[PDB]
Design a protein around this nucleic acid. Sequence first.
DNA 1: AGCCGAGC
DNA 2: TGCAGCTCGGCT
DNA 3: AGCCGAGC
DNA 4: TGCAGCTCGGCT
Lengths: 724, 724
Amino acid sequence: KGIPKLDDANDAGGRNSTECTLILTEGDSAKTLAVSGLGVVGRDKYGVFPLRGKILNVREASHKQIMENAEINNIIKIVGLQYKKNYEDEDSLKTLRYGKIMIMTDQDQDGSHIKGLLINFIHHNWPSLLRHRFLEEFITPIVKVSKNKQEMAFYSLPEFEEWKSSTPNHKKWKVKYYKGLGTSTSKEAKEYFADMKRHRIQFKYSGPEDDAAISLAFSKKQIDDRKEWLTNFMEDRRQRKLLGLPEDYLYGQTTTYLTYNDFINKELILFSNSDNERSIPSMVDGLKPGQRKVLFTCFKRNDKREVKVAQLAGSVAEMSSYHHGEMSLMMTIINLAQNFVGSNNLNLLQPIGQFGTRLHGGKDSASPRYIFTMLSSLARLLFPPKDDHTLKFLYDDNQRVEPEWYIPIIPMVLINGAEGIGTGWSCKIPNFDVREIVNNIRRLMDGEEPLPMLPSYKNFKGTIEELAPNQYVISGEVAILNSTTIEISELPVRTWTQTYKEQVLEPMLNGTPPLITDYREYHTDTTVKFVVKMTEEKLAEAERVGLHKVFKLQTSLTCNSMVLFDHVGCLKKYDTVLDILRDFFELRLKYYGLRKEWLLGMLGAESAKLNNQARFILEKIDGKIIIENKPKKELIKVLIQRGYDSDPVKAWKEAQQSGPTFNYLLDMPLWYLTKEKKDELCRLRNEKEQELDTLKRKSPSDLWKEDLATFIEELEAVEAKEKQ
Amino acid sequence: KGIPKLDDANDAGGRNSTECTLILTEGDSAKTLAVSGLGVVGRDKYGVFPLRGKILNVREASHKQIMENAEINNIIKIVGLQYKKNYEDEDSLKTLRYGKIMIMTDQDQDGSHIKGLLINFIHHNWPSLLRHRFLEEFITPIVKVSKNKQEMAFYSLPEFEEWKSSTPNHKKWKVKYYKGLGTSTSKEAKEYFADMKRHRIQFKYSGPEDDAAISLAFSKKQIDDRKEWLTNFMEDRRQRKLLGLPEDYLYGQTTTYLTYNDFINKELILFSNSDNERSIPSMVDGLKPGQRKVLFTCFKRNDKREVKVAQLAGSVAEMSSYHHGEMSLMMTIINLAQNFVGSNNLNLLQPIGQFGTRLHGGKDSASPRYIFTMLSSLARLLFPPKDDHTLKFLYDDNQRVEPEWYIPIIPMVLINGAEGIGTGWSCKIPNFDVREIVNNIRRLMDGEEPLPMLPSYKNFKGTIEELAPNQYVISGEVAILNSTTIEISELPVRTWTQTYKEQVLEPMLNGTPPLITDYREYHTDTTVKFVVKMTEEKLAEAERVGLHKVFKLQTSLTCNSMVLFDHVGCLKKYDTVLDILRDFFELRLKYYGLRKEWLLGMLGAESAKLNNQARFILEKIDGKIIIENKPKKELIKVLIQRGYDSDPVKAWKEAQQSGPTFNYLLDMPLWYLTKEKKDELCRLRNEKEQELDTLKRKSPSDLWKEDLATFIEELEAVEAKEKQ
DNA sequence: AGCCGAGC
DNA sequence: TGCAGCTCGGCT
DNA sequence: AGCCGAGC
DNA sequence: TGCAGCTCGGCT
Ligand SMILES: COc1cc([C@@H]2c3cc4c(cc3[C@@H](O[C@@H]3O[C@@H]5CO[C@@H](C)O[C@H]5[C@H](O)[C@H]3O)[C@H]3COC(=O)[C@H]23)OCO4)cc(OC)c1O
Ligand SMILES: COc1cc([C@@H]2c3cc4c(cc3[C@@H](O[C@@H]3O[C@@H]5CO[C@@H](C)O[C@H]5[C@H](O)[C@H]3O)[C@H]3COC(=O)[C@H]23)OCO4)cc(OC)c1O
Ligand SMILES: [Mg+2]
Ligand SMILES: [Mg+2]
Ligand SMILES: [Mg+2]
Ligand SMILES: [Mg+2]
Ligand SMILES: [Mg+2]
Ligand SMILES: [Mg+2]
């Protein structure tokens, strides 16, 4: 009736107005899918309107924000809803243009969140409408299987997994994952609406417990409630896993009604947990799942030259089975690369291009399609390649992907800090000096006491003092030049240059009466320098009061919510950063033991293989073995009867979960019969034998010291080049 | 005063209004660079406003379009310009808010076109203003070099190339290309405006010859002029190339004034030529530079699975040195993939997703980030891999890229047609049947006369008759069902279904008096079916008049401007499609000769290498050669004394522009001393020898017939699967 | 007076 | 090409 | 009462 | 994430 992107129903606003249905979809792509499915007949009774992502939570939202929201204003106009109107009587429902609203989103956790926000909107503004079976949802499959011309659909991952357990020949079926509504074709869309019984679920009001559930999820007043709520979920799911029990799921059979209580505690709770899993980092590598996928990809690619952020994002997506919008990966990549004051002490990705500055706090970054990046030379030193063999890599989309966590040589979570916002919890950890952390590691390794650590930011000329535990004061730098002039040499951490000029200095220049007379900017892209001119009286006043206080060069930093995932996926709340450092130390020391154990096995096999290859060559030259014009099968019998071992590297690798293999012996070129290459082979076997023996007489701590030494050397070199 | 994206000057609209300067920039990214450059103390006198791409040509534009143009209305409001006002007197110039307009665009050909469009705007509306030195331009470098701490800038590619000629050690310097204003940093931006003298060029009126130059470039009445204008440029530049002479350029030294005549004939002409080069396809492969880069990339990648169009575009850009917006590449990729009626007879890229239909003529395509594509199975058959070794690959950005043209087995330009719009010329070539083209090729190869070819479109049920040469009539299909009902089974080529419904049937239903009573749609995604209800009198009337005429199911097709680039980069205008077919035949036949010659060399070398390797093994087994524990130098002497040839493949590779190399002999594994592998080696030697002998007894025409045969077979298989 | 396509 | 909405929790 | 970041 | 302006020449 005057709104774009709207495919309004034809029978909307007549006698049969209550017999119409409005389909709210997850985006415009979803709108197209719904439209194709609903045709050709049914345009009269069914309407479609796309929602541009997640909508507004209006339960504690201000009056200004709610009225100035375009999304909900469109919905109100289309449906014909009226603000603060009671719909208890069956006559008030006749006023609306549509009878029922069917929410059709993705079959992912985010889709569930969208449904919840819509429900929250209706429940808060019109509680009467919710008790009249006004809301429903259109569900679409997420996994499909077919062997011949028969087809089966699943509507949840637990359902699909349970099917593979019951069905023996599950590998004889095609497997098609549905990332979203966009995956489904127009033809498949028609088949969906043809079987409306299966894909239609009606929301049912059962009592006050529903209101309690809805309020639980979307009230800012009930945060502690959601904490216990999710704590129970995490613990129970953990126990189900320990007892070897499958997760419960919905939409297994055809269901008519769905309680709001059940919806919140069986579907929406899945989102809130996944939100915490993707927003709150792990203590081990300080990475989130999204970030870790990027790092895993860059490690797998091993690019020697720069790569577009946009291009890299796509690579990460396909190689790490990333099932979200690529824009998020791009923003993550940019964030990981930033290295201005207040961001990262040790950026894992190189910011090659305009990734933002301290001027606008990174917001001045260029388009991801116009900037380049690659691994920092410190990345594979912080996360040594040798440790990859002791990690547990996840499986998704029929391929191996990122591990549950990487195991860096120093607690990375303390280096670039940690910021994240989920449901129930949120994480906030300040940055710390790398060299200082390395030192504390060495002290803990020497059985000494770890020194207390103050938050330290790279290239920050200011100071950071501690008052109460986990409560700090960050101060910039100011200096007196004369009776009328002062110099501001540093702003406090995360206090950006442009914002400071607009929010602090410009008010001081104008109007409360003016304080400063004039100011000049001498900023570089990495440093801050303000020169301020004042009267002699004004400066004398500010001097006794406190220059830092007057010019707002002090910011407070309270970090009590240091919430992280431990090495087993449990949400721990760490009290001090030394707790994090200690727990990390235990785990890291253990995995150095594990690395040595693995390396012993590998180097052992490799030495054994070299032993066989050397013996084979020498016996051939001595004439103890004839292979010229000899058949393969006969020659194999010869080797076995002469006691030659099967491929040790192959045999050892297979032990990490066709007859004997002697290919590695004959795969050797004719070169290794020459004198120069024979000596080289005998040299390599002795050298490799030596490496194994050298490793045996080294403690895990010794190996750790090696990595730390190698890291520090390059760290100095890198930061030196930075200063230059 | 009410316009967004505007950083208006502070002294605008005062006494010093004529002392102000307005900077019109190429986009918003350019605005940021200007803003950064004028800082930190330079402001008040300088204003910045971004132009959203190329603006409107107002020389022959309608009154409605000019007044309803947002771009020019903003400039007029900001500067304070008045329509049809004389500015000869020095008092009228005080009325404006700005004194001078400085145009700051990229240093590319497109930027030049923008400057030209601005000049055209001013010259046409206010000729008096042009004679007062009102317009100027801000120029930025395109290439920078630096060896130590000294830096040099170039403002044109010919200047940089001339510099590399004059400077011996040009490789000891860093080379930084500037794709656009976005490439320059904030620091470099500041350095540009700091040296205002160098980067400021004032436009100067010299006489009536300037008006003639401006009119030449932007008047629709002077098209034939631009043909000769560009004809002279192409011929002169061609001769300069043949004589080894450098191109002329501007901005070598610091210049104060620049005449409009020189600007048109030395800068804008570069654009118009580049426009023709990127819009008009080559006769050889029927591809444009943009399209060819996509195909070259897809050939290099050899993807076995689908790829996002967005993702692929980025891949093409970096791998083929593409220096334009990736969106152009995305639209190009989509265009190459389309396969509905009226588009491509043989799409080189598979349209996996919504690439558009005949319903809305391809405009209904989905987002490039949500659709996939890959090479058609016919692609590497049309463009045989064996021909890649005879092509001339271009060099750009220090890497190899697409060739000047590919050499397909059949004239691809005639298959999917050819559409392009440049300056002076424009291309329009209809589609032709593949099999008919294959046949005429075979006829020309058999020494017969080529048969005349009518335009043929794939899956087109209609008819195409020829009236005058290069003038055709395309007719749809209509049938009489009864006295009141007719069936429209096909619309003429490129007459879209939705457009036909709105522009033909709907007027017939309403209001001139109504003709039809009712109509129904029975369309699929690939076919058209209209059923129309009329009175017996109306149908009888339309029947005698002509149903095709009445329902406008006939469209005319005149193709006189069949303009293409020949095999040497000269713009030729072909009269008939048989001329294109004939010229192609000569070139293709020549290159089949070239292919055989190259293959003879390669296969010869490969056979020689296999001969030596086979002989070496047999002599070793027979005991004619001892290599066990023998020194390298001694063993080399043995081989040379036994007449063993040096590495033939290596020798042959090097011929395509210390001492004998026998590595290939000893590089062979010990396996090849065994019976099974010895027989394997001897078979390959015989097989390669056979392949060489087989090639020898084949004419170039014989090889061509082979490719055509292999192509036709797969063509049948593909098109069969399509119909199913 | 609008379509066709590679560009800003 | 640049442009815009919202979530979720803790803190100034 | 607005920032921080991975998501729609 | 989807959205919008214009060029250039030949033809209906
Ligand atoms: C009507 O088009 C649709 C829009 C959306 C939203 C959206 C919605 C907006 C809005 C902006 C956005 C936008 O996020 C902006 O995008 C930027 C993308 O690049 C990075 C660098 O930075 C991001 C911004 O932080 C974010 O502000 C979208 C990107 O991916 C989405 O999911 C976003 O401003 C006004 O309302 C979803 C849909 O269907 C699910 C749609 O059909
Ligand atoms: C935002 O501000 C700027 C805009 C531009 C233009 C542009 C200008 C427009 C306009 C749209 C566009 C747009 O093209 C649209 O994009 C689409 C994107 O890809 C495919 C899918 O299809 C393309 C459309 O055919 C085209 O309609 C731009 C894409 O790349 C450009 O060069 C385009 O509508 C109104 O005016 C240049 C600048 O600096 C040089 C700017 O700062
Ligand atoms: Mg989704
Ligand atoms: Mg950070
Ligand atoms: Mg450009
Ligand atoms: Mg075409
Ligand atoms: Mg909030
Ligand atoms: Mg025109």
